[PDB]
Amino acid sequence: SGAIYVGNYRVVNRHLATHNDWANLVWEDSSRDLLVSSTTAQGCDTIARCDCQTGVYYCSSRRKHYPVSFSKPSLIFVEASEYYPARYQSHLMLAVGHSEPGDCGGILRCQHGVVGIVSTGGNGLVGFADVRDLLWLDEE
Numbered sequence: 001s002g003a004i005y006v007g008n009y010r011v012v013n014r015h016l017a018t019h020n021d022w023a024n025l026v027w028e029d030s031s032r033d034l035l036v037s038s039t040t041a042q043g044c045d046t047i048a049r050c051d052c053q054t055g056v057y058y059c060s061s062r063r064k065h066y067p068v069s070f071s072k073p074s075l076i077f078v079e080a081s082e083y084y085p086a087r088y089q090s091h092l093m094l095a096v097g098h099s100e101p102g103d104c105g106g107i108l109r110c111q112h113g114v115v116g117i118v119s120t121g122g123n124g125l126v127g128f129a130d131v132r133d134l135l136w137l138d139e140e
């Protein structure tokens, strides 16, 4: 579990969104595994606006932050699960690292701010949903 809290927005994995998220919806995209809902309180996270390919992510199944090298946001095949049929998830970045069920929502960050959230794992790989292109998260 986990979210990004920037301005009056809450960014979560679409497959983990709550009823309150859907009832206060700003934007969602199944192909990216992202959903954004509105918040009453202002958040403290800042979004990175950069092309970093190195950063640090939080792994809840290890209670640890790990430094990783990750690929550029791309269209990657994701195996069928209880949450989506086999498909291609867009704007996904892969790294070598531990990710298992319970880990979606952990933040990936760089020197500039939050880069994205854990969206996949298994096989010694971790996949992150990028948010750096969502410029509207920084305003209104």
Ligand SMILES: NC(=O)[C@H]1CCCN(C(=O)[C@@H]2CCSC2)C1
Binding pocket: 015, 033, 078, 081, 082, 083, 084, 089, 099, 100, 101, 102, 103, 104, 119, 120, 121, 122
């Ligand atoms: N982004 C996806 O399609 C996710 C949905 C949940 C299932 N996915 C996973 O990778 C599992 C949970 C973390 S380790 C294995 C794919």
Ligand SMILES: [Zn+2]
Binding pocket: 048, 049, 050, 051, 052, 110, 111, 112, 113
């Ligand atoms: Zn950066």
